[PDB]
């Protein structure tokens, strides 16, 4: 082996992450054949599966030369997995992780969420610095074909993602959140267009195909959530056509593809049996068939230009940086249309830049200085949320709803949105002392999905 071969594997695994479960929690999909615990906020324990991925990252770093670009990339991959892990749980193994075998008698101590977040922000800072000005020629880079500047852009965008998630904090470790954010924007580099997306391209070849291709979970029981359809339809958003089918009955009636009334979903917060009746009757939309019938569908975007620009828009509104928030917002929306136009081939004519410009003039979408601050934030977060259908943002749109309040996810009376996940049973079984110490440091001994983690306090 060699680091190039290992990079290919590490990069594929990281950039191929996606979560249909998250899309139930984020009110895009429903299950009508049974109760989805994600749809109705009944999850309990999470899992530590990303530690296996982290062990592969470690192997790639150990095989590479000290100070090499591969080592910089390892910091990026570590940051991405640790960020996702800490958002799930709070305190997690970090500094003490990955030093013994997974099945060793020794199991790792947990670091506080603040320590993890500050740590990975510093790892990303180090990665950006390591790559700066580098003439190193790497191989196996299936994301950016060896362009180290593109990696720096992605690293910096990721730092902004993390920092914006910490909008409720002045400091994280010794890092001043707003001043660090501003410094990164000033220094750059940042993604400049959709071409700079941190995304994985799929190919019609063994082990290289889109992850939902021929996924059996797309048959019976899977439909669009009525609230997501409504968010799109009320904005006259033609990305609706790209993500969803018409209802079977609307198709039968010969309603136009761009007739917003020909799309409908099921109510996620009523008993599923009632919504199954609506779906059986032919009155619910399903995910577009390209999501499971095409071997390359669309690239999986770990972190893209659309999100980056909307992070920047929010930072302007919050006063963290100067800039034109309207054009950050509009550049993001326009780029999202450009993305869907490429991959939603059957509805591409509705997704031109002329269509984007019209969409941006719609009620509920149009952005201007006269809007209230809360309205601006809602606009921005909504545009971050809408294009994350079956995408590489994984649970992040759910956590952004916890941070910002947007969207306000439909749920039955008395149902709370979980803040986090409980620790895996395996941790209680084999790492009990360290788990107990983590619960005592965080929540006075409690481990509940309703325990509010540090980043939201
Ligand atoms: Cl090397
Ligand atoms: Cl570990
Ligand atoms: Cl478990």
TrEMBL record:
Keywords: Signal
Pfam families xref list: SusD-like_2
Alphabetized InterPro entries for the sequence: SusD-like_2, TPR-like_helical_dom_sf
Protein known as: Putative outer membrane protein, probably involved in nutrient binding
Entry superkingdom: Bacteria
Residue intervals passing through the bilayer: none
Keyword Signal tagged: yes
SUPFAM superfamilies, sorted: TPR-like
